[PDB]
Amino acid sequence: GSEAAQLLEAADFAARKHRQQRRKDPEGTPYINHPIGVARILTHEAGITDIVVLQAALLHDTVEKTDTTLDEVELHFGAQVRRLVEEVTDDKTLPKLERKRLQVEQAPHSSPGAKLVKLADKLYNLRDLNRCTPEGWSEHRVQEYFEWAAQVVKGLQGTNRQLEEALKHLFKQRGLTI
Ligand SMILES: NC(=O)C1=CN([C@@H]2O[C@H](COP(=O)(O)OP(=O)(O)OC[C@H]3O[C@@H](n4cnc5c(N)ncnc54)[C@H](OP(=O)(O)O)[C@@H]3O)[C@@H](O)[C@H]2O)C=CC1
Ligand code: NA
Ligand SMILES: [Zn+2]
C-alpha cells in the first residue's frame, strides 16, 4: 500500500511483539519507544525515506528480543526487510562478550541499510544513557558503554554524515574520538 500503511504494519507488529517489554531506565519505559525512536532518527535526522530501511528499524529488535522468527519477518515484510533484520540481530546463542566483540568485528562488512539502522540504534541508546543512567548502573559502566560503542561506530563510517556527526559530538563530550 502507501508508505504510511507499510510503516504502520511494521509499527503495529513491533508494538505487539514488544508489548510486555520495558527499557532499563528507572521508569521502565515501554520497549516499543526505542524502535520507534530509532526509526524517527532515520527520517528526522538522517533524511532516510527507504521504506525497507525504516521498516527494518521498527523491527530491528523483534527477532533478537522476542519469539519472532526471521521467517515470520519475511512472511509479513518480505526478503529485503528480513535480510536487514537478520544483519542487526545478535546471535543470542553466544556469550555476551562475544556478541559485544562481533558487533565491532562485523560492523564494516554490513550492508548500507544495516549500517543505517546500526548507527541510529547506537545514537538512540547513547542519548538514552546520557538522559538517564539505567537502573543498577554505575557512572563508569555508562562511560564504558560509550567506549565500546565508539569501537562499533568506527566501523560504520561513510554511511550517513548527519548520524556520524551526531555520534562524534557525543563521543567527544566524553573524551572519545571517532
Ligand atoms: N563497568 C561496569 O561497571 C560493568 C560493566 N559490565 C559490562 O556490561 C555488559 C553487560 O552486558 P548486558 O547484560 O548485555 O548489558 P548491556 O551493557 O548489553 O546493556 C545495554 C543494552 O541494553 C539495551 N537498553 C535497554 N534499556 C536501555 C537504556 N535505558 N539505555 C541504553 N540502553 C538500553 C540496549 O540494547 P538494545 O538497543 O538492543 O535495546 C543496550 O545496548 C558486559 O559486556 C560487561 O562487560 C557489566 C557489569 C558491570
Ligand atoms: Na546486551
Ligand atoms: Zn535497538
Curated annotation (Swiss-Prot):
Its EC number is 3.1.7.2. The modification N-acetylglycine is found at G1. The keyword Hydrolase applies. InterPro entries: HD/PDEase_dom, HD_domain, MESH1. GO terms for molecular function: guanosine-3',5'-bis(diphosphate) 3'-diphosphatase activity; metal ion binding. It comes from the Eukaryota. Mn(2+) binds at H34, H60, D61, D121. Residues 31-126 form the HD domain. The modification N6-acetyllysine is found at K24, K96, K122. The keyword Cytoplasm does not apply. Keywords: Acetylation, Hydrolase, Manganese, Metal-binding. The active site is at E64 (nucleophile), K65 (nucleophile). Its cofactor is Mn(2+). CDD domains: HDc. It catalyses: guanosine 3',5'-bis(diphosphate) + H2O = GDP + diphosphate + H(+). SUPFAM superfamilies: HD-domain/PDEase-like. It holds the Pfam family HD_4. ppGpp hydrolyzing enzyme involved in starvation response. Belongs to the MESH1 family. This is Guanosine-3',5'-bis(diphosphate) 3'-pyrophosphohydrolase MESH1. The lineage of its organism: Eukaryota, Metazoa, Chordata, Craniata, Vertebrata.
